[PDB]
Each structure stands twice: as structure tokens, then as C-alpha cells.
RNA sequence: UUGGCGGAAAGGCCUUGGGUGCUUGCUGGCGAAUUGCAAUGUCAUUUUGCGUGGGGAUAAAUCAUUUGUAUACGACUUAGA
RNA sequence: CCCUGAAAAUGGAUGGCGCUCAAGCGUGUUACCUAUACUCUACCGUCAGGGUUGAUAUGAUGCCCUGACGAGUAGGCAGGCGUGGAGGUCAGUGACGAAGCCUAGACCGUAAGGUCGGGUCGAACGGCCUCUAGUGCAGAUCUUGGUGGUAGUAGCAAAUA
RNA sequence: GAAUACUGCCAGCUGGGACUGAGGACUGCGACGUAAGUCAAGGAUGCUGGCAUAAUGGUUAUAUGCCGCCCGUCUUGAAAC
RNA sequence: GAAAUUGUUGAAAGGGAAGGGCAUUUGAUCAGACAUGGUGUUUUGUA
């Protein structure tokens, strides 16, 4: 339905979002995921830190350089979870994976575009209230990501600029709604209301 | 106007397959808009064209067409089964494809 | 035929690392080049547009001797000689043009469409 | 110009080749059955080559027919060609490979007079 | 799959069309197979089966 | 001899086919096609154009016209499986369509020798069109916006689901 | 064309002024056929070459020689109008 | 149900990703996916049961109708393909080119194989009915002969120059 | 005093879709008809268009999806370290 | 004057083998049918 779909990753569950997105890429939809530092994983922070340490133990014994690579950024953690669900070793899998780019924060190509959510992977819609969850940025900076604060500063600046945008947009739409209400109850308005618009 | 589309867009998903054996004679098509077999029953018997391009001009055109039709619904989510004169080349998994509205019955 | 030979700086001209100076091969090849240039001037060629158009080397029958190895054994000691041939030609101009006619087949719908375009525009 | 026939169907148009004829040069690709005790081809495992069997047999109304619709009949001279005088719509002549050109012109002339189809009217012809 | 109660594709085990290449014997079995097919007498069927028999199954009388 | 002989030759006489039992009953059209219906042409040269349906012909085809003054579609025949019968209805009583039949549209088939290397209309056809369309447009002028509706083309926009759309 | 803003991967967003074209906001006039009952019925963007005619600028690297802070050979570090 | 009890050696496996009002556990209801299995149809073969010497034209081991059946090592049987030589026949092919060889060119047969076109070549060879055998190769650390990768590699360094 | 659910029946009507068209003078069982005859009754016909050529197709190379362990032998068991 | 094996030219593919099966795309290459008897003589060489 869309050329590129921009997904705001905030408040989403990692596995459910990855299983949605992998099927979208295999069907041929182009997906870009922004704000990867705000993904959520169900479970305690200590459980997921222990899980990452169990993953971090695994390496090739005779040469650590050819072993499993333990990527530390939240976007690369999401990429790992998604590459697990795409059959990446085939040409179809590579062609699917080249339709995806995942970012921490919202870069300047995508800060002026529209962000969507996936309601079947949202934490507030999936988890029972009371279950504990993690933040992927906190887990990733606990296991070695170096750029948690610069992303926070850039996101603060971007949010200030976006609020400055939204004030003007709200004023303009209030003018347009006022003019539409005053130009209603004419004959064309009543004919459109009879016809359903 | 600015739009001239008289077909419905669809995606070529895969072949008919088991877990480890595929069957290229039957293709699986996701028609956009339909999400149930009862709505997919409208599209049975409709013609499908896969339209692609080539470098070498054959009979006045560089655009080649592969024709087929919808035969039955597939699953619970509005995917349909489609058969073509020559089977789809399997590099078109995820490629766009056109479902026309003829043969009509409305 | 370059495995386990030494590496050198003079392969940078050809983008390789492994290069050598086969003096005997150069002597034989340049003798054949001189003979071909002599044949070309005898035939009456320009002697300034000549480039080596063809050259090939393949194997002559081997010449065998013997080698004496430990615990009283015999092995072979064989020379691998060469047959060499080469052809020098004048560098000519551009080869040809004016390709095939490519007769076209159009349906009635295509012909009507082209006629409609020719009518509808100028 | 042939007799009407049903649509000719080949159940297996691909040539049956011997296992590992692609692998070794000493193994020719004429078909031999694998009689080995562990042979995957003999045991008919999935993904291996198929074997010739009687189920691939051509239709008896369609068997031995050329795509033109005739059966090939080898001829060597005019007397062999004349046997197909009353059976032109079912048989088509084929000149044998060892016939000279000055006889081939005679056989082609007589076949054109009798209305007989020749399947190789271009062998040893000079132009 | 069929649970077969018998041997599939087995021959009847009774000799027809005798193994000899005698042309006069073949003419005789042609005459008597016509007679056994159409005269509806048991004698013709009996002598037609007796014409197929081998030498040790035809002792001298 | 190269090949010996066949011991038996097959007979060259062609047999006759058996006596068939496939009679021709007439076509039973679908219920939404009544004469005077506005159709949408799904395929063809005039695809996406809205025309009016006049008469069911002999070879199961539908006689349609634009009218030619409105959208430039002449008197024509179309296939019933390649149109959409919209609910918009005009009355075509007062039009004498019994003149047209299957022999009225003849192509005058071309020989194999006449090949168009690089590259007209019947006067009987053009005043027949002029007779019928002036009777149609008088019925068109009664309800508003039909001339504009028939002049405009049909196309599917983003978000149009044809299994949910009513025509 | 005037003025800004945007460095996370800015390469885009906003704005001033005039020109020019269209306007289906409303009412008219002319054209369309024959692609013959359908045939994607061809309208997109990606790279390169060759021509025009209009600007723009007039280098280095390697081999060879040399060095020994380097070195199995390559490689490295130096020097040489 | 969960937890403690619960310690092994390369890094690690509910198949993996991952999953927490589950994508876990117990249970129930529907819809859906697909085996060479089942149903129907076509075709091939096998087996069985039948029909059909009438004239014309052939083949009665022929033609035709009906039904069922088809896995397979060791092994048995049947019908065929191919090779050297022999009797007969085609008053067979051939220096206007036999045999052989090459050919991601064509045709026929389920297959063993057969046929044709092109190139090369230079003197004999083939179809059919029969007879005969020193008659069909991927293997035997097979025999003889030829040729590779290894590989321009190991190396060509004792006896003062 | 009713309705509806549930289950079951109809030799009730009717719409859409897919695959197949074997056989080749006639013979049979039937149906509608007073009759001539007709029919969906022992297997597909009717109408129309385009092309008439590498377009369909065959072969071959490559690409893609899924599958595919090295043969022969002894062995209860071989891809076997 | 075969094959193993090799050189040149041409075409093609190549991210820790290669080769194969089913299916189709793409490129290259290729066979067959295309007259037919026919009302007919709009006809020349008049049949
Ligand atoms: Mg020595
Ligand atoms: Mg081989």
C-alpha cells in the first residue's frame, strides 16, 4: 500500500515486531525502523542481561574473530532478532534484508515523514499490566553501547523542532476547521451530508 | 484524470508447498484489500497478468506478459491460488502483479 | 603456472605480484618475432601498423633422462619442449556497420495504435 | 498433408542418462541400471534422477509418429521409394545416409512426382 | 495400497496355442478353435484342449 | 533395401465422427443487463469509459453506444463478460436498433499478400450513429450530470475495494 | 527571484515578489469511430557510449637509481631537474 | 504450576529466531495447510474373461470389447537391443565417396539403441530370415600402454677458491 | 397458544469458480410430444479474433525457489573416522 | 588420427567446493506445419 513504511520502534516488543517486519520484507514491503533504542523486551532487566551474557560467552575457540559476532547497538540487536527469522543465507533472504534499514533515533531523512505503529506488537496492548519489561537502550548501554547520551541529546533537539512544527500545524488546522464549519450548512453541504460526506 | 488503473494490485508470495517440497504449478497471490475467503470469493476466475520488461524488442515492444487466472482461495486470510500458462519464474516472489476485473459477473 | 614463485615489485605494471624474467623463453620468442617481421617485409607489409594478432604455445613431445634416488631407485628427468606459432597483422580501420534489416511483426491492435498516434499528433 | 491424429504427447521428453556420467568420463551416458546395494538411484530417493519404466510409454495412436504426422521409412533407391505409393499420408521417406548425390536427385524427382514427402531433401546438395 | 488375497498378475497355467511349430497342427487348432467357439458342444472344447498337449501328455493308444 | 517393409499397412481412409448431441440453446444473460443500462468498459480500446447498452445481438454480444457526441465512443458491440453493469439506468425506448445485426459489422478480411509495411469510415455507419445519438441525448438531458458522468472516465483510486464497491 | 532555517546520514523545509500556463467554481460550440467483441497494448528510472554547442582546469603514481629508523621476497621509510 | 534440592570439562542449541492475560502448561470448539494414501478421468504395461475366417487386402501369434492390477535385494522366468563370423535374400549402398571419427544440430523408442544433416576421410559395407560364438565393463591394491594435479615445486649446499 | 434453536429429509430452486472433452457412420436405455419430430438420452460442439512467425514449442547455458552425502563391496546396520 | 591431458580464440558463471532433480525467466540455437482437391478459368506457354 505504501512505498516505504516508517515504524516508530518506541514501546514495541522485539520479537513480535521482528516477526511482523520479516514477513513484510519477504512479501516485498520496504520498511525503515526508527527509534530502536526504545524497544521493549518482556522480562526483568537482570534476566535479559543474563541472557545477553549467555549469548556473549559463545565464540569460536581456536579464533574468536570468526565466531558469532555480538553486536551491541539496539538497532543491531533488532537486526539479529530479525535475521533469525529471515532465511538470510539465500538470495531471496539477501534481497529481503536489503529492503530494511534500522536506526537509533530518527535521522534527518525520516524526521519529516510519518511514523506508524504495529498494534499487535505494542507493549501496552500485549503485556498484562504488572509484568516487568526492559528498555533496549538501557540493556544495550549496559552491555557496551557507547552512544546512549548523544542519541538522547539529538532526540531532545529533534523533539523541540517537532513541537515548533506542531504548533503551526495545529493553528493552521484550527483555521481550516473554522472555515469548514462556517462554510457548512449551505446547499452543497446539505447535499454532501445526504450523500454521506 | 491522473489515475487510469482498471486492475487490483497483488503480490506473488510463493508457490504451493509443504514444509520442504514446493510445487511451481500453483502460485500463491496476496490481493490487497481482501482479508477473508468470503471476500476473496469475488475474485475467483479473474485474469491475472504478470507484466515485466526485457532489453530485447520482440514484436514491437520491450514489455512481456505472463497470463493466468485465480482458481481458489487459500487459507483464512484472503490469499488465493493462481495458475498460469507458464509458471511464474520464482525470482518474482514479492513482485507486483495485476488482477483484472474480467471475466465479469457484476 | 605461478605457484610458489617469488614476489616482486615489477608486477605492479600488470596488477600482479608474481612475475619473473624467463630469459631463454624471451630469446626464442624474440627470434620468432624477428622472423615474422622479416616475413612481413618480404610480403610487403607496412611494418608500422603491425601488432601480434595471434600467438600460442603448446607442448612438444618430452625428452627423457634418468634420475637416481635413494635405495637404488630410478625416476624420470624430462624436458618439456615447446611448439610456438605467431601471426602479425596490420592494424586496420573500423570493421563494419549496416546490420540486419530486422523485419517487424505487428498485430492489428499495434498497427491501429501507431496509426492513432500518427493521427493524433503531428 | 498427413492423416489426422490426436495431439502428440511425450510423457518424458528428457533423455534418461546414467548416474555419474557427468561425474566420470569413463562412464558413458547410455542408460544402465544401478545394481548397487546402497545406490540412491536404485532406491529411488527424493531429488535423484528418474529411471525408465513402462509408465512413460507413448500412446499407441501416437507412437512412432514424426511431428509432421508421418512415420519415417528409410529408402535407398527408386524401387524402395515406390513402396510408399499408396501410403503417402501415413509414411514419409528418408534417404539413407550412404546414397550419392546423383542418385539423391533421382529419388527426390520421383518422390516429387509421386507426391511422397522426403524428410531430408537437403543432403549432399550442391549450390 | 490393496491387501491382496491372491497373487497378482499370475498366468492361468494352462497351455494354449501349442508350443509346436507344425503348420498343419496350427491349421487343425484354427479349425477346432472355430468349432469350440461356435458349435457349443463340449466335444470340440475337449479336443481343442487335447490338441495343445505335449508328447508325454499324448501317450499312444 | 535399407528398411525392409511393414508387414501391414494402416488404412488411409479417414472415418466419420459420431453424431453429436450438443444443440445450441440461446444465451441466458445475467439479470443486471437490461437495455438502457450504463456500462463501464473494462477492456478494449475504450476501457474505463461509460457507455449505454441498447440491444442484445445474435452472437451473444451487446450493442452499445457512447453516445458519440458525449465521449467519442461510436456504435459498437462488446462482450458481456468485459463490462460492469452499473445501477444507473436511462430509458432507450424510441430508438430503432433492429437495423443492426451481426452482418452489419463486417471486417472485410485481409489477404496474406497485403502486408502493411508502414500504413475510411462508412457513411452508412456515420449517419446511423447520428440518428441514434440524438435520440439518446434527449433522454440524457432529463436527469442532471449524466452528460458529465458519461464524458468522465472510470478508474480505481487508492483504497477502492471492488468486492465492496457497488456499481 | 527575495529572505531565512536545517550537520545525526544536513542535500531538504518554509517564505517574498513578479512572469507564464491551466482551472472541472458555472454555462456553451467542434473533434474522437476502423485498435473492428479482449490481448501490459507500450507513457517509469538505472547506467554507459557517441554526436553536437556552451562553460571550466592545465596533474600525478609506478618501475628503474638511492636510503636503512625497515626487511625472507613483496612491503615500509627516505632522497634525486 | 513454580522454586530449593540440581556439580564437568572447545562455544551451543524446545531445530533456530524468539516468546510472558504466550508463540508456555491443562482443556474445549471451529476454520485452515498438505503424502507417491483415498475418489474421478486420461495414457502405458501385465493378467483375466469374451467377440470376430464372411466377402475385398494384407497381418487369426491379428483386430476389437470389458474388468482388475502395478513396491522390491538374493533369485527365477519372459520379451527385446548391440558385437565378430556363416547359409539365404534385397539383380541392397559405394571413389559423383564405403568404413571409421568429431558435432551444448534434427527425428524415433520407456530403455538397451536406431536414423538423418554438417565436417573430416579414403575402400569397402549394410537391411531382413536363420546359424554360430573367444559376444556387451567403472571397479578386481586387475593387465599393457599413455597422461595429469602435485609443480616450474622438493631440490641441484661434503672434499678450503 | 405460538415462534425459534438443534438434528434430520426433499427424485426443491438457483449463482460463482477450477480441471477434464477420452471415443469416432448407425444400433441401447430413456424423456418431451397426439403425431411428425425434438432432446442435457451409450464421452464437445457452435461462434469469433490475432498470428502464420522463433510467436508457441524443443534443445542448451545461466539465474531463482525447494530438494539432492560417493560409488562398488562385505554386513543386522555405510556418507562413514 | 579417438580419449585422458594441453594451448589460443569465442560464449557464460563464480562471497568456504563442483556436479544433479522438478519448474519457469533470460540469452543463444533449431525442426515441423502452412501449397491443400476446390466453385473457378478475373488466364497466359492454350489445354
Ligand atoms: Mg640422486
Ligand atoms: Mg561421460
UniProtKB/Swiss-Prot annotation, chain B:
GO molecular function, one term: structural constituent of ribosome
InterPro entries linked to this entry: Ribosomal_eL33, Ribosomal_eL33_CS, Ribosomal_eL33_sf, Transl_B-barrel_sf
Gene Ontology biological process terms, A to Z: cytoplasmic translation; ribosomal large subunit assembly; ribosomal large subunit biogenesis; rRNA processing
PROSITE patterns linked: RIBOSOMAL_L35AE
Keywords, in A-Z order: Acetylation, Cytoplasm, Isopeptide bond, Ribonucleoprotein, Ribosomal protein, Ubl conjugation
Cell compartment(s), UniProt: Cytoplasm
Gene Ontology cellular component list: cytosol; cytosolic large ribosomal subunit
PTM-bearing positions, type N-acetylalanine: 1
Quaternary assembly: Component of the large ribosomal subunit (LSU). Mature yeast ribosomes consist of a small (40S) and a large (60S) subunit. The 40S small subunit contains 1 molecule of ribosomal RNA (18S rRNA) and 33 different proteins (encoded by 57 genes). The large 60S subunit contains 3 rRNA molecules (25S, 5.8S and 5S rRNA) and 46 different proteins (encoded by 81 genes).
Name recorded for this polypeptide: Large ribosomal subunit protein eL33A
Lineage: Eukaryota, Fungi, Dikarya, Ascomycota, Saccharomycotina
From Swiss-Prot, chain C:
Subcellular locations according to the entry: Cytoplasm
Keyword terms: Cytoplasm, Isopeptide bond, Phosphoprotein, Ribonucleoprotein, Ribosomal protein, Ubl conjugation
GO biological process, one term: cleavage in ITS2 between 5.8S rRNA and LSU-rRNA of tricistronic rRNA transcript (SSU-rRNA, 5.8S rRNA, LSU-rRNA)
Single Gene Ontology MF annotation: structural constituent of ribosome
The UniProt record lists the keyword Ribonucleoprotein: yes
Domain of life where this protein originates: Eukaryota
Transmembrane segments: none
Modification type Phosphothreonine: residues: 8
Entry GO terms, CC: cytoplasm; cytosol; cytosolic large ribosomal subunit; preribosome, large subunit precursor
Subunit architecture: Component of the large ribosomal subunit (LSU). Mature yeast ribosomes consist of a small (40S) and a large (60S) subunit. The 40S small subunit contains 1 molecule of ribosomal RNA (18S rRNA) and 33 different proteins (encoded by 57 genes). The large 60S subunit contains 3 rRNA molecules (25S, 5.8S and 5S rRNA) and 46 different proteins (encoded by 81 genes). uL22 is associated with the polypeptide exit tunnel.
Extra facts: There are 2 genes for uL22 in yeast.
Family of the protein in this entry: Belongs to the universal ribosomal protein uL22 family.
Name of the protein this chain belongs to: Large ribosomal subunit protein uL22A
Organism this protein belongs to: Saccharomyces cerevisiae (strain ATCC 204508 / S288c)
Organism lineage: Eukaryota, Fungi, Dikarya, Ascomycota, Saccharomycotina
Residues of the full protein shown: 63 to 184 of 184
From Swiss-Prot, chain D:
CDD domains assigned: Ribosomal_L32_L32e
GO molecular function (one): structural constituent of ribosome
Residue numbers carrying Phosphoserine: 39
Residues making up the signal peptide according to the UniProt record: none
Keyword Phosphoprotein in record: yes
InterPro entries the record matches: Ribosomal_eL32, Ribosomal_eL32_CS, Ribosomal_eL32_sf
The entry's keywords: Cytoplasm, Phosphoprotein, Ribonucleoprotein, Ribosomal protein
GO CC entries: cytoplasm; cytosol; cytosolic large ribosomal subunit
Location in the cell: Cytoplasm
Biological process (GO), any one: cytoplasmic translation
Chief place where the protein resides: cytoplasm
Keyword check for Transport: no
PANTHER family assigned to the protein according to its UniProt record, in alphabetical order: 60S RIBOSOMAL PROTEIN L32 AND DNA-DIRECTED RNA POLYMERASE II, SUBUNIT N, RIBOSOMAL PROTEIN L32
Role of this protein: Component of the ribosome, a large ribonucleoprotein complex responsible for the synthesis of proteins in the cell. The small ribosomal subunit (SSU) binds messenger RNAs (mRNAs) and translates the encoded message by selecting cognate aminoacyl-transfer RNA (tRNA) molecules. The large subunit (LSU) contains the ribosomal catalytic site termed the peptidyl transferase center (PTC), which catalyzes the formation of peptide bonds, thereby polymerizing the amino acids delivered by tRNAs into a polypeptide chain.
Family per record: Belongs to the eukaryotic ribosomal protein eL32 family.
Protein name, per record: Large ribosomal subunit protein eL32
Origin organism lineage: Eukaryota, Fungi, Dikarya, Ascomycota, Saccharomycotina
UniProtKB/Swiss-Prot annotation, chain F:
UniProt key word Isomerase: no
InterPro entries reported in the protein's UniProt record: 60S_ribosomal_eL6, Rib_uL2_dom2, Ribosomal_eL6_CS, Ribosomal_eL6_KOW, Translation_prot_SH3-like_sf
SUPFAM superfamilies listed in its UniProt record: Translation proteins SH3-like domain
Region (Disordered): 1-21
GO cellular component: cytosol; cytosolic large ribosomal subunit
Major location category of this protein: cytoplasm
Keywords, in A-Z order: Cytoplasm, Isopeptide bond, Phosphoprotein, Ribonucleoprotein, Ribosomal protein, Ubl conjugation
Assembly and oligomerization: Component of the large ribosomal subunit (LSU). Mature yeast ribosomes consist of a small (40S) and a large (60S) subunit. The 40S small subunit contains 1 molecule of ribosomal RNA (18S rRNA) and 33 different proteins (encoded by 57 genes). The large 60S subunit contains 3 rRNA molecules (25S, 5.8S and 5S rRNA) and 46 different proteins (encoded by 81 genes).
Misc. comment: Present with 38400 molecules/cell in log phase SD medium. There are 2 genes for eL6 in yeast.
Protein name: Large ribosomal subunit protein eL6B
Species the sequence originates in: Saccharomyces cerevisiae (strain ATCC 204508 / S288c) (Baker's yeast)
